[PDB]
């Protein structure tokens, strides 16, 4: 179903042709073509938005489609399926030609670069294989099966080091820069890799909540006894109230329906992961909600290009004798948020354009990041808008060239 978000309406509902169960969605940049693929039919349906009819049923997988995406630059549809393949379909413009790629095993999520040249693909054996689309060739994979924290369930009879319930990443997403991949899965950990160096940056644990099942690594032997486990008895009898005794649960109903339409405790899992298109954050939808993880330069001491003569005392001195360009660049070299704010408001409105012209190329992205972070919640709208006009005005074309380092900042 398509939804407006100004007048709040289904303006269309594309339907099937025999009503199958749709399980992934992908839609063009110039939002006129919607593809969806199901786990039922292994044919990617393609509807056209305006005339709500279906243009095509692009077929050719042998095994259900697990993801789809659109390269938003070159506009190609790369899709991937439990086939153990990727197919890059080129749908517009007399071609209708298609190019397959064999991956080692059973792919189950996909992610296109911002740029449109690369596809990262998260498979069932536990790699992220990063391919190049103009060629068909694998420009790097990263092996992951190890740095993943699968816990033991109370209803398990096999060790967590063997439990292959969750040794893979079912969701993936590049950065908006082209440098990181966040991946998350059916387990207790979100892992954040760097794409060039192939080596991971942090592993985040979604929860520590022993009222979820996949969350402890090693259970307790005080619990398991001759009867069986001990968290697994029924205690609804103990409850003092009829609606707390009543236990509807249709037997073996693995993840559908209400929460007590199954007699099993929830499992920690990350259902889906994304980065933030504006700030430094990412967000991951999981069992207990959407975990939103973010950043503070105002806490970490991450200087840039330092030297001996660059102190907060020295930059304040550079203000008080008015070499405003130098005071600003010393602020950006020391990289301390209060300091940058301090000089930012010291320098005066006549002198703003010359400074904005003479800033260095290396520190341009940082000054843009700072203006964004101050700007959404500050009040000096003339100060900020004068700054932004001068910055774009004097360094527009450079930004235009380096379109991708500045995606989030702009």
């Amino acid at each position: 179903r398509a939804w407006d978000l100004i007048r709040y309406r289904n303006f269309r509902t594309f339907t099937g042709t025999e009503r199958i169960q749709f399980n992934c969605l992908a839609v063009d940049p110039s939002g006129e073509v919607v593809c969806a693929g199901s786990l039922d039919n292994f044919d990617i349906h393609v509807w056209s938005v305006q005339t709500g009819q279906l243009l095509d049923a692009l077929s050719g997988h042998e095994g259900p489609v697990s993801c789809l995406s659109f390269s938003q630059e070159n506009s190609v549809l790369a899709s991937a399926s439990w086939d153990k393949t990727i197919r890059i379909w080129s749908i517009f413009g007399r071609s209708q030609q298609v190019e397959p790629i064999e991956v080692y095993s059973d792919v189950l999520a996909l992610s296109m670069r911002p740029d449109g040249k690369e596809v990262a693909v998260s498979t069932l054996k536990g790699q992220i294989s990063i391919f190049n689309i103009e060629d068909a060739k694998q420009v790097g994979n990263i092996d992951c099966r190890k740095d993943i924290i699968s816990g033991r369930f109370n209803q398990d009879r096999f060790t967590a080091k063997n439990s292959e319930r969750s040794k893979f990443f079912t969701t993936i997403h590049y950065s908006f820069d082209g440098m990181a991949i966040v991946a998350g899965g059916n387990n207790n950990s979100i892992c954040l890799y760097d794409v060039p160096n192939e080596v991971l940056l942090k592993r985040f644990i979604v929860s520590r909540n022993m009222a979820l099942n996949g969350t402890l690594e090693f259970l307790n032997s005080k619990k398991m006894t001759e009867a069986g486990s001990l968290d697994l008895i029924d205690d609804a009898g103990e409850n003092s109230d009829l609606e707390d005794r009543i236990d509807n649960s249709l037997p073996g109903s693995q993840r559908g329906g209400d929460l007590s339409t199954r007699k099993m405790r929830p499992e920690v899992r990350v259902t889906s992961v994304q980065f933030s298109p504006t700030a430094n954050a990412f967000a991951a939808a999981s069992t207990e909600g959407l975990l939103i993880y973010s950043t503070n330069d105002t806490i970490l001491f991450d200087p840039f290009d330092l030297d001996v003569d660059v102190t907060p005392h020295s930059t304040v001195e550079a203000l008080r004798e008015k070499q405003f360009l130098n005071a600003l660049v010393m602020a950006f070299r020391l990289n301390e948020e209060y300091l940058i704010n301090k000089v930012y408001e010291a320098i005066p409105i006549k002198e703003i354009p010359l400074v904005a012209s003479n800033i260095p190329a290396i520190y341009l992205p940082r000054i843009l990041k700072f203006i964004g972070d101050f700007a959404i919640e500050s009040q000096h709208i003339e100060f900020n808008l004068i700054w932004i006009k001068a910055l774009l005005s004097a360094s527009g074309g450079y930004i235009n060239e380096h379109k991708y380092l500045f995606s989030t900042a702009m």
Binding site: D156, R157, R165, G252, S253
Partner: protein, 122 residues
């Protein structure tokens, strides 16, 4: 049944409910419409349960061993594996029930037929 025969609501609802239950697999044929009250049994629902399907597909030897191998954790339906002997498997997931990867039971099949390939770590 107590509604009258020439009645398209009745005809629509029974044709639709038969096609529902047959897709689930609890009744085998979709022609005779008396099968709702005649051949819909707790035993039919049980024999769509998970261990029985392994046993029918010959992934086991007997339903006790299918149950045992499920419980020890060798069986998966698609990507995600089942510890749950009481899982009810619709026809289209009967296509996808399979062994897990790198289990010792998978290796035994392959090593017998003499097709282990350790690049797969099968």
């Amino acid at each position: 049944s107590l509604l009258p025969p020439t009645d398209p609501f009745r005809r629509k609802h029974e044709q639709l409910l038969l096609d529902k239950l047959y897709a689930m697999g609890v009744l085998t044929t979709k022609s005779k419409i008396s099968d709702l009250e005649n051949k819909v049994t707790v035993s039919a629902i049980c024999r769509r349960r998970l261990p029985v399907i392994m046993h029918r597909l010959k992934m086991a030897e007997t339903i006790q061993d299918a149950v045992k191998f499920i419980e020890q954790g060798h069986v998966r339906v698609g990507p995600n594996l089942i510890n749950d002997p009481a899982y009810l498997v619709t026809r289209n997931m009967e296509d996808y029930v399979t062994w897990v990867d790198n289990s010792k039971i998978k290796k035994t099949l392959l090593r017998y037929r003499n097709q282990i390939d350790d690049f797969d770590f099968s």
